[PDB]
Design a protein around this ligand. Structure first.
Ligand SMILES: NCc1csc2ccccc12
Ligand SMILES: [Ca+2]
Length: 223
């Protein structure tokens, strides 16, 4: 997260870290067994880390649970990033408590102008590199479809939205991938892509979660 703030320990209780020896992506806990992330975060050997603040220090609220199954969306295209979503099942159910909690799925799509919370352990600089140990947060609005399309001609599908600031300075970034965009207590986005981070006229692009709720539910119901 570039241009954000320290969230505070365990204040984003659905935020998980995907770990394969190291943090490499965020995700969102959506029930005791299942995590939402980005399909471009797929790999084998994932351990889900819940209850994290400092991802380098064991602070006392973590739960570490290995994935049993990954399901990338059936229509994910890794060239266009269309349908950039996957589900990860945990080998055992997480213990749910104030610091480890699921985030509700949307029952309707959010509109441009809605305020959201984006979070992660990704890069905090727009030039150069610095990775935080504690969770960072950013409040950002959803941008109109038309400004998203004009920012990224030919590349925004109906499964994507832009959020952030056309002026630059505040955005998600590499290592935030797969993490939440939460708006009024519903998971509306997943950190997906952009051109650089926090550049002028290049806002972040996010998977439009409300298009996937019936796929999510039917997948969970059968797996
Ligand atoms: N908002 C931009 C963004 C999000 S994840 C990622 C990974 C690499 C480069 C940019 C980004
Ligand atoms: Ca920790």
């Amino acid at each position: 997260i570039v241009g954000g703030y320290t969230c505070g320990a365990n204040t984003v209780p659905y935020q998980v870290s995907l770990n394969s020896g190291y943090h490499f992506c965020g995700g969102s806990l959506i029930n005791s067994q299942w995590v939402v992330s980005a399909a471009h975060c797929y790999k084998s050997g994932i351990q889900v880390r819940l209850g994290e603040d400092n991802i380098n220090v064991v602070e006392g609220n973590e739960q570490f649970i290995s994935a049993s199954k990954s399901i990338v969306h059936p229509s994910y295209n890794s060239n266009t990033l269309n349908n950039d979503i996957m589900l990860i099942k945990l080998k055992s159910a997480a213990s749910l408590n104030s610091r480890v909690a699921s985030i509700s799925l949307p029952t309707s799509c959010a509109s441009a102008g809605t305020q959201c919370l984006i979070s992660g352990w990704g890069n905090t600089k727009s030039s150069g590199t610095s990775y935080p140990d504690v969770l960072k947060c950013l409040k950002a609005p959803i941008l109109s479809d038309s400004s998203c399309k004009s920012a990224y001609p030919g590349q925004i599908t109906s499964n994507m939205f832009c959020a952030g600031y056309l002026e630059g300075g505040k955005d998600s970034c590499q290592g935030d991938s797969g993490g939440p965009v939460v708006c009024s207590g519903k998971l509306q986005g997943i950190v997906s892509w952009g051109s650089g981070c926090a550049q002028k006229n290049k806002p972040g692009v996010y998977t439009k979660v409300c298009n996937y709720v019936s796929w999510i539910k039917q997948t969970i119901a059968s797996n």
